[PDB]
Amino acid sequence: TFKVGDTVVYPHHGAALIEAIETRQIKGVDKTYLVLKVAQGDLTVRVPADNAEFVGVRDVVGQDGLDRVFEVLRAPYAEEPTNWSRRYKANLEKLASGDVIKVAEVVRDLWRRERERGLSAGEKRMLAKARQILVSELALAENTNEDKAEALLDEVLA
DNA sequence: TGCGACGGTCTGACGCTCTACACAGTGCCAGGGGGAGATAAACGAACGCTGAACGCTCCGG
């Protein structure tokens, strides 16, 4: 399931690459510890393989991923409650859900409501964070990375 | 009640000046009533314009 030299995406940090496999023991119990790091936060994440599905790691989605994200990115008839408090409580929960599709409609709704009205600048921080984590994710998912990954969105978001 | 002691309470604790200085860890947006501030009009008065008019010294045929 998990190998060395491949890339897997971690929640709240974007995609990352696996360095090697260690044999660290926690609470005196030996575990198959896997270590990986990201270049954004400059932090190393150590997660055992037994609870990898429990902690919520996902592998890189192949061709199936881009077509479904593009289709949802353009889905019309999207509605939200009039009160901003319910949407404010829902957006971070959907971000913490970790689904690529879910964060796709979240960022599409956020971008369209930011362009149509210009809400505020406080929400722009998490908007930019979501944009950064999605462009880091689609770096390996769509096989386009860095500036090329950012460029592809520039003409498909409208 | 008389006793001590235990306790809180309270006060200052000589004097200026050469010198002398400043001060920090936890939300957010929409709707709505005032008032300053730009716009064009408007009430009122006087400020110009029309040369005209009152009246003198005037060079004058």
All residues at 6 or more sequence positions from A23 whose CB lies less than 8 Å from its CB, including other chains: A30, A32, A33
CA(A13)–C1'(B16) in Å?
A: 68
Quote the distance between the C-alpha of residue A27 and its chain's center. 31
Residues A86 and A106: their CA atoms lie apart, in Å, by 14
C-alpha distances in Å from residue A155, one per residue of A68, A101, A119, A125, A151? 17, 19, 23, 23, 7
Calpha distance A77→A155 (Å, rounded): 21
- State the resolution, in angstroms: 3.7
* Chain B bases having any atom below 7 Å from a protein CB: 27-30
Q: How many CA atoms lie within 13 A of A42 on its CB side?
A: 0
Spatial distance between the Cα atoms of A36 and A11, rounded to a whole number of angstroms:
13
Rg value, chain A, Cα: 18
Tokens of A88: 């404010």
What is A54-114 written as a DSSP string?
Answer: HHT-EEPP-HHHHHHHHHHHT-------SSHHHHHHHHHHHHHH--HHHHHHHHHHHHHHH
Closest nucleotide (CA of A83 to C1')?
A: B30
Rounded Cα distance, A147 and A94, in Å: 26
A45 strand-pairing partners: A36
SS3 A125: helix
Q: At A138, list the tokens.
A: 């689609």
Is the CB atom of residue A81 positioned under 7 angstroms from any atom of strand B?
Answer: no
Cα separation of the two ends of chain A: 37
Whether A9 and A137 have beta carbons less than 8 Å apart is answered as yes
Question: What's the distance, CA A145 to chain centroid?
Answer: 14
Tokens 């479904």 correspond to what residue?
A68
Q: Is the CB of A85 under 7 A from strand B?
A: yes
Q: What b/e readout covers A54-93, taking b as 16+ CB neighbours within 10 angstroms?
A: eeebbeebeeebbeebeeebeeeeeeeeeeeeebeeebee
